[PDB]
Amino acid sequence: TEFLKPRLVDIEQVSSTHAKVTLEPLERGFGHTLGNALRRILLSSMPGCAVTEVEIDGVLHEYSTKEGVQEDILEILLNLKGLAVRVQGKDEVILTLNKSGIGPVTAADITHDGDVEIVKPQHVICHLTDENASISMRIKVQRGRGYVPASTRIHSEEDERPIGRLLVDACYSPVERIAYNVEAARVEQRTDLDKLVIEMETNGTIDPEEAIRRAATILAEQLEAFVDL
Amino acid sequence: SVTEFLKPRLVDIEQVSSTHAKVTLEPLERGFGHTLGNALRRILLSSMPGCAVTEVEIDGVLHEYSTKEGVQEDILEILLNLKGLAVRVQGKDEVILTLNKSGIGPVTAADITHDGDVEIVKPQHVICHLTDENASISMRIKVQRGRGYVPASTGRLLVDACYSPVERIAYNVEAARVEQRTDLDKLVIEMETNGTIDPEEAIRRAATILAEQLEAFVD
Amino acid sequence: REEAVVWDILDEVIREHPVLLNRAPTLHRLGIQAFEPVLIEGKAIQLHPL
Amino acid sequence: EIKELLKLGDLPTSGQIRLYDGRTGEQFERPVTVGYMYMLKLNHLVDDKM
Amino acid sequence: KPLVGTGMERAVAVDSGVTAVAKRGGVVQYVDASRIVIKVNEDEMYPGEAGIDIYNLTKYTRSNQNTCINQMPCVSLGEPVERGDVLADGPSTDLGELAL
Amino acid sequence: QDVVLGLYYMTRDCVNAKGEGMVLTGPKEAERLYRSGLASLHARVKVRIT
């Protein structure tokens, strides 16, 4: 009986989306146990904030098309689904997108807010193809976790949403791929101490320093039952 | 509800026997059944600590290749059967016991030199059978405290050490539902232990260790 | 109304009531068999491998 | 030529890679074939037939 | 697209009659996912005619199997095209290559 | 078809394998060994059977 506890010795934020973090020291096997449990938890349960509804000024249904736009309304909605933003201390927010003139319509055109931060401003929503062409939409963003298809959503809302509100399927989970690599560390002049290095590719909304802590918190609280016998 | 994951209530703990039970957890979020079950297995099966025999010295024999007479079973069989012995050792790292027996009859675990600090959980554990009127054996059995199941990788004789008392743990996940969804997991855990530690507390320990390892990040 | 209580009624009605499953073309008698049903979210019929 | 093209990438010339089971973190014994197969959704979806 | 095809798509998707094909060479002037208007170059312009060729793309329309057959553009404003080029991808086609 | 493949793979034996030649006190200990990764499935061993 010599067990040591892991500590997040280092975190390397190599990019706005890709990062690595090392937990050290870890005894035998704990590298595998933590690496896989935390991988599953981070892939499944990490909350994020994603677009949930859209409302464009002059359109009626997603299958229609807007005048002077290169992308059909369906492709506009698909592009909006890929938008990734942060919100500061709110459960939902409504952002207006007001734009006109020939050229692209990028996420920068959205009316920025102090509590709303866009991870990739270079996101293109659609292309306007007329001098007087213009699109205004009211995007709705909600916090959450997991993936909520629109079919489940409207049938759980239990009220008839008005004509012109289009609903997109939200993928709240902000992490894309989580890999863990276990490798020895020179600690206390003794071997068989695994340094677990987790490298995660995210959308860029959350920082790993909080992601790993939330995953660990989830694991511990679920673990409460097995110690409650 | 972004931080409101479901917490299960144990349906049961069917102790099919004093050694093994069927602890069932219900319900768990989808994907949490394996996340918890495999981690508990990985703790119990290879990191649980306990005291087990690791070295043996039989009287006047150099190796299990040599099959000393007077005993119905061979030295290799003696070593495997001695490995099966479960012990509870209080407050020592390693101990040297002595087992001595004589007469026409089997040698049973009740015959060891009980120091009082050492508890042999199964006195009825059969060791071997003596096959002569003068058949007598005496051996020094080394016990050591450690963790996990140490193989034979390492006048002494080495034996595999079953420090972890969990003989077997197997788990299954299955569909369980609430009033509106059938995507949730019910976790059926089964474990059989050597008997030194009751299973229901064994899992309590396992979760203990894991939770401790999670302490530095959770707030 | 597919009330959530109606599902509890179904889960009680279907408890021990066999259902006959009958792939067609049923050349031999083993092509029709009785099974104890269990509710599944999807729309496909869950069949046993063996 | 398939081998030559795999060699152009950093991919294994064997064509088969080792995978890890997501539920238990273990590595599958012996590598497995992994690639990009072009798949088509046939027009026989269940909701038209249940 | 298919990653591994046989090159036969570049013909099957064109001769299927489902993709909008540039009748003459020219330069794109306006696109709105419904009508693509091409300034057909004077080398093939009729002396008295307009000299500018529209293409009213067909949007969501039911097929014989109750499927949608909308055509979507792929060319960009100001892009030069030559007679026979695929302007708008039909259903199951993308960038002029069949992709089921 | 798949089950028999699984059993064929599980009960087959190899000449040299990890965990070969030792003595196991019973099937349970064998299973534990495999799940701890200390032994290969096709390893040759002497187990006390009852």
Q: Hey, CA dihedral for C25, C26, C31, C35, is it positive or negative?
A: positive
Q: Hey, CA dihedral for A40, A42, A47, A48, is it positive or negative?
A: negative
Report how far residue C25's alpha carbon sits from residue C46's, in angstroms, rounded to the nearest whole number.
Answer: 19
Nearest CA in chain B to C42: B182
Which residue, among A59, A79, A77, A80, has the nearest Cα to A68 in the 3D structure? A59
A59 to chain B nearest CA, in Å?
Answer: 33
Q: Are B64 and B80 in contact (CB under 8 A)?
A: no
Which residue, among B94, B143, B154, B147, has the nearest Cα to B120 in the 3D structure? B143
D11 to chain B nearest CA, in Å?
Answer: 31
Hey, how many other C-beta atoms are within 10 angstroms of the C-beta on E91?
Answer: 19
Domains of chain B by range and CATH? Answer: 2-49+164-219 (3.30.1360.10), 50-163 (2.170.120.12)
Asked if C44's CB is within 8 angstroms of D47's CB, the reply is no
Chain E contact for A130 (CB, 8 A cutoff): yes
Residues in A closer than 8 angstroms to E71, CB to CB, are none
In DSSP terms, A141 is beta-bridged to A51, A93
Report how far residue D19's alpha carbon sits from residue A151's, in angstroms, rounded to the nearest whole number.
Answer: 34
Chain A contact for D9 (CB, 8 A cutoff): no
Widest CA span in chain E = 47
Inter-helix orientation angle A30-45/B199-213, to 10°: 80
For tokens 């152009």, name the residue. D8
Nearest CA in chain B to C6: B179
For B37, the enclosing helix (H) or strand (E) is: helix B32-47
Which residue, among E92, B185, B210, has the nearest Cα to A38 in the 3D structure? B210
Amino acid at A69: V
**Least CB–CB distance from C4: residue in B180, B182, B183:** B180
Report how far residue F28's alpha carbon sits from residue F48's, in angstroms, rounded to the nearest whole number.
Answer: 11
Contacts of D21-24 with CB under 8 Å at 24 or more apart are D22/A36, D22/A39, D22/A40, D23/A40, D23/B34, D23/B38, D24/A36, D24/B34, D24/B38
Widest CA span in chain A = 75
Nearest CA in chain A to D25: A36
CA atoms within 13 A on the CB side of B20: 14
Which residue, among B133, B67, B141, has the nearest Cα to B105 in the 3D structure? B133
D24 to chain A nearest CA, in Å?
Answer: 7
Amino acid at B42: R
Report how far residue A61's alpha carbon sits from residue A76's, in angstroms, rounded to the nearest whole number.
Answer: 12
Q: Are B131 and B70 in contact (CB under 8 A)?
A: yes
Cα-based distances in Å from B95 to B52, B120, F18:
10, 13, 31
Which residue, among A125, A108, A141, has the nearest Cα to A70 in the 3D structure? A125
Q: C14-43 burial, b if ≥16 CB within 10 A, otherwise e?
A: eeeeeeeeeeeeeeeeeeeeeeeeeeeeee
CB interface of C with B, residues 17-46, below 8 Å: 39-41
**HEC string for chain A:** CCCCCCEEEEEECCCCCEEEEEEEEECCCHHHHHHHHHHHHHHHHCCEEEEEEECECCCCCCCCCCCCECCCHHHHHHHHHCCCEEECCCCEEEEEEEEECCEEEEHHHECCECCEEECCCCCEEEEECCCCCEEEEEEEEEEECCEECHHHHHHHHCCCCCCCCEECCEECCCEEEEEEEEEECCECCECCCEEEEEEEEECCCCCHHHHHHHHHHHHHHHHHHHHCC
Asked if E65's CB is within 8 angstroms of D38's CB, the reply is no
Q: CA dihedral defined by B152, B153, B157, B159, rounded to 10 degrees?
A: -20
Residues in A closer than 8 angstroms to D25, CB to CB, are 32-33, 35-36, 39
Q: CA dihedral defined by A39, A44, A46, A48, rounded to 10 degrees?
A: 140
**Least CB–CB distance from A32: residue in D22, D23, D25:** D25
Chain C contact for D47 (CB, 8 A cutoff): yes
Q: Are F23 and B80 in contact (CB under 8 A)?
A: yes
Q: Are B101 and B78 in contact (CB under 8 A)?
A: no
Residues in B closer than 8 angstroms to D21, CB to CB, are none
User: For the domain bounded by E18-92, which CATH number is listed?
Assistant: 2.40.50.100
Report how far residue E29's alpha carbon sits from residue E42's, in angstroms, rounded to the nearest whole number.
Answer: 14
Q: Are E12 and E32 in contact (CB under 8 A)?
A: no
Q: Are strands B118-120 and B20-21 parallel, antiparallel or unpaired?
A: unpaired
Which residue, among A40, E17, A27, A146, has the nearest Cα to B2 in the 3D structure? A146
Q: Are B217 and A37 in contact (CB under 8 A)?
A: no
In DSSP terms, A53 is beta-bridged to A140, A167
Q: Are B95 and B120 in contact (CB under 8 A)?
A: no
Joined together, the tokens standing for residue A123 give: 């996101």
Q: Hey, CA dihedral for B9, B14, B19, B23, is it positive or negative?
A: negative
Cis omega (within 30 of 0) for bond into B27:
yes
Q: Hey, CA dihedral for D26, D27, D32, D34, is it positive or negative?
A: positive
**Least CB–CB distance from F36: residue in B46, B84, B152:** B46
Chain E contact for A220 (CB, 8 A cutoff): no
